[PDB]
Amino acid sequence: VTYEEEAVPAPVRGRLEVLSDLLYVASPDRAMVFTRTKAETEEIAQGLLRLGHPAQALHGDLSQGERERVLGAFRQGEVRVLVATDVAARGLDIPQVDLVVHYRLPDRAEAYQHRSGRTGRGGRVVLLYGPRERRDVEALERAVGRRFKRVNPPTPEEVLEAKWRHLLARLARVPEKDYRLYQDFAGRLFAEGRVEVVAALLALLL
Template identity: 50%
Template sequence: MGFSTTGLHPSLIDAVTEQGYTEPTPIQAATIPAILAGQDIMAGAQTGTGKTAAFALPILQMLSQAPIAGTGRRAIRALVLTPTRELAQQVYKSFVDYGKHSPLQTALVYGGASVNTQMAALAGDVDILVATPGRLLDLIGRGAADLSRVQHLVFDEADRMLDMGFIDEIRRILKPIPAVRQTLLFSATFDAEIFDLSKSLLTNPTLIEVDARNTVASQVEQMVYAVDADRKRELLSYLIGSKNWHQVLVFTRTKQGADELASEMCKDGLKTQSIHGDKSQGARERALEAFREGAIRVLVATDVAARGLDIDQLAYVVNYELPYNAEDYIHRIGRTGRAGGSGIAISLLSPAENYLLEEIETILDSRLPQQWLPGYEPDPTKEVKRPRNASKGAQKKRARERALGQKPGKKPGQQQGRGRR
């Protein structure tokens, strides 16, 4: 089955083919016809499943076929909101690549870049705007962004926008946008907050889920190594060196932790750089490009900095520290196993993080058996100190369970002994 079955115009199919894609992914096959039919969509889509093309292609087609109202400068008719700069850049590139055979113009605005340059871009013809919430609000306040004729509104990675506290910005951005519009909401995870948000944004939405909710790609092998916290770096360098891994993406919880780990791994002889929110946009882009080209072997990132990273054939993702938010685990390991490829997701588990693993297993509805390497076994005589925010994580877990109608602590449909998904 090719893209012709989705109802796309031949010129768009040609553009997709030029990018190397001949068959739609499941999310594209399910979503593109519904969007072309004008439906509001609430779609569950993991990273690496082709979700950007799932909304970019039909939007390009509908805008190309719709008459442009009025005269003079063309107005913004499609708005795509993303949580991070990296994801915004990725989405923008997709619109440009897929729309190369059309006269439609796409603009990109995000924080950390020249606001004057972005204002100049918006002063010209812009049909599609890809934006992060904070910078877009700034431009609206300056009178540089007119959203009064938006016909298509997309929330990409809506769960991440909520996690990052953008709900107030979203409400303010919605005020100048017409109530009569098509709204598309894409999220890798669904919880009570997402459903509450959808009720205020979408009209009679079609729910599309091509995989079980809150799952990871089946091609990703998930492995957990139990190890003392103070030996994690040693074990990580050993795994990368002994197994000759290249292009390894490592996640830490904090910016300082990312910098410190990158520095120590360089001392181990592994070319490593870190990216996080305190680094300039230019520094982050240079580090990412060096990682893509193989000039550096390991990239250490925080969750926010890694959103939107699009790296072909990334085989290894390592959770140096488990995230406090269990849904972040899905986003992290979604960096590998993309577009049908295979990947390995390693989690280095200290005794104090066991409660975090339990929360991850709850949303996965799967057990992740622990193992250890000889010589790196956790020391049973060491005192385990539970982090101060452990109670916060437990409270969030219980609140999520109550919102979903579950009994606290219960893992519905739990299956024992499953280590891979």
């Protein structure tokens, strides 16, 4: 064990947004989110993509090729979050990561180490848990013989500033050509002096 362990309260209803928030504030080069079923990896991964993270599901129905591209885009940096089940996460082809998140709790201690050991190229392991899930976290803590520091979810201001920076990376990727046709409308908003409008755009894209 070389990592920080945190258990973060997160109601199953708003788990996806808690997870996104965490990813933004942490800003890992590489994150791995574990979940129980392969169907969940693809709901989560799609969700995180909606919310602006470059996320990809890793699960057992992927063809070797599909796996090879996901894991390839992972190493390279093109993809930053992998949402995986325990079984699909098996193998020696997965690069070690900065952060591991337990989107759902591991059914046993072994699964907890197998999941958690993937971090620390030690990095940070975060467990999300629900209201009637705290008994479960306490068991893991006993199985594991270790106590997970209890930490609150990120604050909406920490989150907001992190979003803004992540957005500035995205924009920077837009090729000059793609945006030269608009540089005129921007010169208008700017010179014409309208802050409210620019803040209005951000309000959407953020």
